Amino acid sequence: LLPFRFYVKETSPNYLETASPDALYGDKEVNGKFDVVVSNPPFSVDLD
């Protein structure tokens, strides 16, 4: 849950590094490069 600049891969193209504000979404960063997102989010995360 960090900005895409943190994900730095020291080799090959880094698709999870680009970012750009989106017009019709809160003027916030949107990667918009992947096609399928499969995941199982944590049931109850508390952060800090």
Place this chain on the structure above:
Amino acid sequence: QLNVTDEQKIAEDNVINRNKFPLNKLVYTVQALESLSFLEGRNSLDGK
């Protein structure tokens, strides 16, 4: 491999915790785990 840059974190750590991992076990593991490549060793006779 882990893409960490903090010198303090990468220097103030260790592969095994010592007191929770006896050195004899470390020697046995480190020397038994060889004789097979963990990169290309997969051949499964014929079929990988």
Place this chain on the structure above:
Amino acid sequence: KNWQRIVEAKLEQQKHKVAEISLENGTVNYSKKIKHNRNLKALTGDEE
């Protein structure tokens, strides 16, 4: 006079390694947690 060279003393004696500069082939590098705009990060005079 020696400010250009005494700055390196404090900037390198630190442990957090936020930034670091070289007298030769200036790469004026700093942490990825800082924005990395203009993409060059080369020593362009005393301004850098």
